[PDB]
Design an enzyme around this catalytic site. Sequence first.
Site, PDB file in Angstrom:
ATOM      1  N   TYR A   1       0.815  -1.220   0.000  1.00 52.69           N
ATOM      2  CA  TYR A   1       0.000   0.000   0.000  1.00 52.69           C
ATOM      3  C   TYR A   1       0.872   1.305   0.000  1.00 52.69           C
ATOM      4  CZ  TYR A   1      -4.002  -3.328   0.930  1.00 52.69           C
ATOM      5  OH  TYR A   1      -4.908  -4.393   0.805  1.00 52.69           O
TER       6      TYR A   1
ATOM      7  N   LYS B   1       2.736 -13.824   6.626  1.00 53.95           N
ATOM      8  CA  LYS B   1       2.999 -14.923   5.696  1.00 53.95           C
ATOM      9  C   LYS B   1       4.526 -15.029   5.545  1.00 53.95           C
ATOM     10  CE  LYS B   1       1.596 -18.215   2.888  1.00 53.95           C
ATOM     11  NZ  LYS B   1       0.725 -19.397   3.122  1.00 53.95           N
TER      12      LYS B   1
ATOM     13  N   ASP C   1      -2.878 -17.219   5.974  1.00 58.63           N
ATOM     14  CA  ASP C   1      -3.976 -18.042   5.471  1.00 58.63           C
ATOM     15  C   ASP C   1      -4.635 -18.835   6.618  1.00 58.63           C
ATOM     16  OD1 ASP C   1      -1.599 -19.611   5.612  1.00 58.63           O
ATOM     17  OD2 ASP C   1      -2.239 -21.041   4.144  1.00 58.63           O
TER      18      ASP C   1
ATOM     19  N   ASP D   1      -5.892  -5.345   6.498  1.00 57.08           N
ATOM     20  CA  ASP D   1      -7.044  -5.008   5.677  1.00 57.08           C
ATOM     21  C   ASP D   1      -7.938  -6.233   5.478  1.00 57.08           C
ATOM     22  OD1 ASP D   1      -7.604  -4.213   2.203  1.00 57.08           O
ATOM     23  OD2 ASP D   1      -8.682  -3.501   3.930  1.00 57.08           O
TER      24      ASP D   1
HETATM   25  N1  LIG Z   1       1.595 -26.919   0.664  1.00 55.78           N
HETATM   26  C1  LIG Z   1       1.245 -27.632   1.736  1.00 55.78           C
HETATM   27  O1  LIG Z   1       0.847 -28.986   1.638  1.00 55.78           O
HETATM   28  C2  LIG Z   1       1.208 -26.947   3.070  1.00 55.78           C
HETATM   29  C3  LIG Z   1       0.026 -26.256   3.338  1.00 55.78           C
HETATM   30  C4  LIG Z   1      -0.080 -25.431   4.456  1.00 55.78           C
HETATM   31  C5  LIG Z   1       1.021 -25.323   5.296  1.00 55.78           C
HETATM   32  N2  LIG Z   1       2.195 -25.984   5.035  1.00 55.78           N
HETATM   33  C6  LIG Z   1       3.283 -25.800   6.017  1.00 55.78           C
HETATM   34  O2  LIG Z   1       2.863 -26.463   7.208  1.00 55.78           O
HETATM   35  C7  LIG Z   1       3.317 -25.802   8.376  1.00 55.78           C
HETATM   36  C8  LIG Z   1       2.149 -25.551   9.336  1.00 55.78           C
HETATM   37  O3  LIG Z   1       1.571 -24.278   9.083  1.00 55.78           O
HETATM   38  P1  LIG Z   1       0.146 -23.848   9.710  1.00 55.78           P
HETATM   39  O4  LIG Z   1       0.036 -24.431  11.073  1.00 55.78           O
HETATM   40  O5  LIG Z   1       0.060 -22.360   9.528  1.00 55.78           O
HETATM   41  O6  LIG Z   1      -0.948 -24.540   8.713  1.00 55.78           O
HETATM   42  P2  LIG Z   1      -1.719 -25.973   8.848  1.00 55.78           P
HETATM   43  O7  LIG Z   1      -0.759 -27.201   8.883  1.00 55.78           O
HETATM   44  O8  LIG Z   1      -2.657 -26.080   7.700  1.00 55.78           O
HETATM   45  O9  LIG Z   1      -2.528 -25.967  10.244  1.00 55.78           O
HETATM   46  C9  LIG Z   1      -3.579 -25.054  10.490  1.00 55.78           C
HETATM   47  C10 LIG Z   1      -4.733 -25.644  11.315  1.00 55.78           C
HETATM   48  O10 LIG Z   1      -5.754 -26.256  10.521  1.00 55.78           O
HETATM   49  C11 LIG Z   1      -6.284 -27.426  11.169  1.00 55.78           C
HETATM   50  N3  LIG Z   1      -6.054 -28.615  10.379  1.00 55.78           N
HETATM   51  C12 LIG Z   1      -5.094 -28.705   9.380  1.00 55.78           C
HETATM   52  N4  LIG Z   1      -5.109 -29.853   8.770  1.00 55.78           N
HETATM   53  C13 LIG Z   1      -6.120 -30.564   9.381  1.00 55.78           C
HETATM   54  C14 LIG Z   1      -6.617 -31.856   9.173  1.00 55.78           C
HETATM   55  N5  LIG Z   1      -6.123 -32.656   8.247  1.00 55.78           N
HETATM   56  N6  LIG Z   1      -7.643 -32.275   9.954  1.00 55.78           N
HETATM   57  C15 LIG Z   1      -8.146 -31.462  10.895  1.00 55.78           C
HETATM   58  N7  LIG Z   1      -7.734 -30.226  11.161  1.00 55.78           N
HETATM   59  C16 LIG Z   1      -6.705 -29.832  10.359  1.00 55.78           C
HETATM   60  C17 LIG Z   1      -5.687 -27.365  12.573  1.00 55.78           C
HETATM   61  O11 LIG Z   1      -6.541 -26.425  13.175  1.00 55.78           O
HETATM   62  P3  LIG Z   1      -6.834 -26.213  14.741  1.00 55.78           P
HETATM   63  O12 LIG Z   1      -5.585 -25.752  15.392  1.00 55.78           O
HETATM   64  O13 LIG Z   1      -7.921 -25.125  14.882  1.00 55.78           O
HETATM   65  O14 LIG Z   1      -7.314 -27.542  15.399  1.00 55.78           O
HETATM   66  C18 LIG Z   1      -4.342 -26.711  12.336  1.00 55.78           C
HETATM   67  O15 LIG Z   1      -3.775 -26.149  13.499  1.00 55.78           O
HETATM   68  C19 LIG Z   1       4.033 -24.542   7.898  1.00 55.78           C
HETATM   69  O16 LIG Z   1       5.424 -24.813   7.944  1.00 55.78           O
HETATM   70  C20 LIG Z   1       3.539 -24.356   6.465  1.00 55.78           C
HETATM   71  O17 LIG Z   1       4.459 -23.638   5.663  1.00 55.78           O
HETATM   72  C21 LIG Z   1       2.310 -26.819   3.935  1.00 55.78           C
HETATM   73 CA   LIG Z   2      -2.472 -22.092   2.084  1.00 59.01          CA
HETATM   74 CA   LIG Z   3     -10.792  -2.868   3.612  1.00 64.52          CA
END
Ligand SMILES: NC(=O)c1ccc[n+]([C@@H]2O[C@H](COP(=O)([O-])OP(=O)(O)OC[C@H]3O[C@@H](n4cnc5c(N)ncnc54)[C@H](OP(=O)(O)O)[C@@H]3O)[C@@H](O)[C@H]2O)c1
Ligand SMILES: [Ca+2]
Ligand SMILES: [Ca+2]
Lengths: 419, 427
Positions: free
Chosen positions: B158, B225, B279, B303
């Site tokens: 921004y 992020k 995200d 935002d």
């Molecule tokens: N490209 C990929 O496959 C991918 C995607 C996203 C993140 N990542 C990496 O993973 C790491 C974790 O990041 P993050 O904690 O921000 O994201 P995350 O792994 O997606 O976790 C976020 C939240 O979503 C819920 N959740 C995720 N997967 C679930 C499942 N299979 N079943 C039930 N609930 C589920 C849990 O929520 P609650 O805490 O509310 O219970 C978890 O704490 C980072 O290092 C990131 O860069 C990789």
């Molecule tokens: Ca994502």
């Molecule tokens: Ca706005």
Amino acid sequence: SPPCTTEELSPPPGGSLVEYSGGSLRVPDNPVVAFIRGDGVGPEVVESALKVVDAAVKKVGSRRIVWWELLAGHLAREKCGELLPKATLEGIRLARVALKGPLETPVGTGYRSLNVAIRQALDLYANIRPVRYYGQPAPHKYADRVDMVIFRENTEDVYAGIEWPHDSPEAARIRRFLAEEFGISIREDAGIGVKPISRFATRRLMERALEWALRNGNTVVTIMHKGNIMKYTEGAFMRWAYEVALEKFREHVVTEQEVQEKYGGVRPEGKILVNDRIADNMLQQIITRPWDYQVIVAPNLNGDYISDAASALVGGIGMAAGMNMGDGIAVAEPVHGTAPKYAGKDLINPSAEILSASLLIGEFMGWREVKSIVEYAIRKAVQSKKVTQDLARHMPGVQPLRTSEYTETLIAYIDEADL
Amino acid sequence: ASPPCTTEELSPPPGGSLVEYSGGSLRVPDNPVVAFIRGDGVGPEVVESALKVVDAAVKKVYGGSRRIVWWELLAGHLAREKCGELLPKATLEGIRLARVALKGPLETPVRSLNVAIRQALDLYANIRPVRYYGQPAPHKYADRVDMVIFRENTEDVYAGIEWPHDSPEAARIRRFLAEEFGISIREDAGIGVKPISRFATRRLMERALEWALRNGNTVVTIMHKGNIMKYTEGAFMRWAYEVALEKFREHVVTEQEVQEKYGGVRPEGKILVNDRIADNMLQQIITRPWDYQVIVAPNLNGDYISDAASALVGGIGMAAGMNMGDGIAVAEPVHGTAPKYAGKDLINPSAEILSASLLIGEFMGWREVKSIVEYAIRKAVQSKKVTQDLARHMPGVQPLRTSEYTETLIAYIDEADLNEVLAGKRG
Ligand SMILES: NC(=O)c1ccc[n+]([C@@H]2O[C@H](COP(=O)([O-])OP(=O)(O)OC[C@H]3O[C@@H](n4cnc5c(N)ncnc54)[C@H](OP(=O)(O)O)[C@@H]3O)[C@@H](O)[C@H]2O)c1
Ligand SMILES: [Ca+2]
Ligand SMILES: [Ca+2]
Ligand SMILES: NC(=O)c1ccc[n+]([C@@H]2O[C@H](COP(=O)([O-])OP(=O)(O)OC[C@H]3O[C@@H](n4cnc5c(N)ncnc54)[C@H](OP(=O)(O)O)[C@@H]3O)[C@@H](O)[C@H]2O)c1
């Protein structure tokens, strides 16, 4: 034993490889599909996926998947002494189709995202993330009105990885260059990132969105952008998307700014409404008015944010499937990542990984029936209150089931079905 | 009276005393001068309503010990009419003298007036409370959303640093990057630059932490992020954690400490300082809103998150806000001038009332005014005594005009039982 090098070349024993030529794809009913267990909860959910689809493909004989394990993340590091082998990338490029679990990315420090490296190295330029309601307990009162597909640009935007630390000499050179040549002033203690958005990348994506809409019967395609503030990246993205829509798909496409002139305020049946929404407004609109949106076309960062937000509405990313799609090559991968607090606890929801597995095999490879048994089973397990904790939370009384026991429930629903 | 057009005409109103800012301390007298700007479109109507509601509130809770001395400044159509210009320097100087101001929405000239105000006054922190007042809402858990977003409001994408893809500027930048760093950017790409600095991040987080201590908030969450943007968002995250430990050590505990140094059982008293990847943060406010209170974010993330949160709560037309700097704050609604409602006595004044409540209740420390105003608005909604924007979602309900809704709020304030309404909420 999984391959560590280009020398370890070896399609599994009893399987021909998927092929791509002349535009068309050939799936031999004897296909090799690559799999990466990934990090944290990854191995847990990938182990469900194959088991679950191996029961699905067995129903409706002529076929069978030969899974071929490739290494990335901790398992590549324990075996090969590096995070993303050349071979792993080669092996997916050879199998043409793969299923991967989440890979760990460190924050502020450490290595660049291996999920992004895979997408960028293999040119999987379209990240297709369907957002669907299957009856699960959900936080949105009108979750059953969310039925969307996100077409997220998968290669550029801030994801390009162009940035310099605030105290690097490189940042100081850019500060000096920008001040002398354009009179732009940036603080001496600022980190600096660069955001590129190109005509070629956005057109490519919009075209795939357009044809996706025409193949499924979608009637609305919405461009999500923050083009009022970022006129020359996000605004350009919006202009370039409208442009291809009108250039290559004129007969199939209509503008809002036209409906209100030539169509008396109403979208004519058979013509896709192409519209756009300011990104913050789009986030509000999926919450307030979810039934008015279908295909959402976004640059990389917006697409990342909208897909997580939309999946949360319908119960969370435990149900959120994905597909990194390039020309004749796709890698199935859930929306959710590594969820390290749930890693080795038998708690995690495998549905997202299973449904990514179904999106690859069903919509892309062409085994449409594996998709529907795939969808019927989850629907049944769901609409009966036999769910993992993430769904069981948003409903009174519902006792939660472990990962393994949820997967053995799905399996039984597959094997015992009226086809 | 008559509002000022020139510096020499600047005279705070009789009976009032100026809010002071010396050291790092805001000194708010019992009879404080508060500037107000009527603004444009529905601005005069909602500002007018907010003055009346706030005055009844302060009289009720402080029994004449306290009283705001409103000081009118001009910006927008009234400034044009009276002064010949949209934003007199005197208005800016007036805010700087008063330290606290309530404004209505302003029309964008056909440079932006709101941006000119924040820049002249260095109002770097954009603050958006998001709360639920009983409205019809799409979130099953709307009543569990009680949040405040501290959004950095000067930098990030921004800042306006970008060039069209076909500019000679962009080509120079492509060449420079290719030669000096071996970076390749496509010939057909627009180029934006994202700056995030130590100084702007620290100031923001400091204000957020100070808010957390003031209001008894127990969690402060950094939205970033930083996995993808290591040196902007990742740095934001690192710098925010850093000032928390440097300048708030005894008051603060970190999520990393909780899982490592403690049992997972966050030590009593301390503010939890944690962080969520952007995200996931968007998911978290929808799946687990009760876990989040103060959210600290760079410009873009802030935002997006505050708008998504407001939509959960059915509070889009009702969202209050404030831009804050060092000794200084300007409150105003999120909404714009709503030109088709202007002068019609139909607009919902709740956002402006709640911006005043934010200013006076939260930034000026007059807690009881916040409690009683929020009490009155919740009672109005429960009673279905509301303006058309809310009534349209309530089958059969006859909507109130702006003026009628204003008088309903005043009657709820005047008739309130302070024994109940201020229990735990005084001092
Ligand atoms: N490209 C990929 O496959 C991918 C995607 C996203 C993140 N990542 C990496 O993973 C790491 C974790 O990041 P993050 O904690 O921000 O994201 P995350 O792994 O997606 O976790 C976020 C939240 O979503 C819920 N959740 C995720 N997967 C679930 C499942 N299979 N079943 C039930 N609930 C589920 C849990 O929520 P609650 O805490 O509310 O219970 C978890 O704490 C980072 O290092 C990131 O860069 C990789
Ligand atoms: Ca994502
Ligand atoms: Ca706005
Ligand atoms: N605070 C500020 O200084 C600021 C912020 C944003 C915009 N603006 C300016 O304001 C102008 C407004 O532009 P616009 O055409 O988009 O109109 P708007 O102010 O954004 O209002 C659009 C719609 O929102 C609804 N709405 C907004 N606030 C409401 C409230 N207080 N109570 C009930 N309903 C409310 C109205 O009803 P319906 O939806 O039912 O039609 C209205 O039609 C622009 O020129 C812009 O520059 C200023």
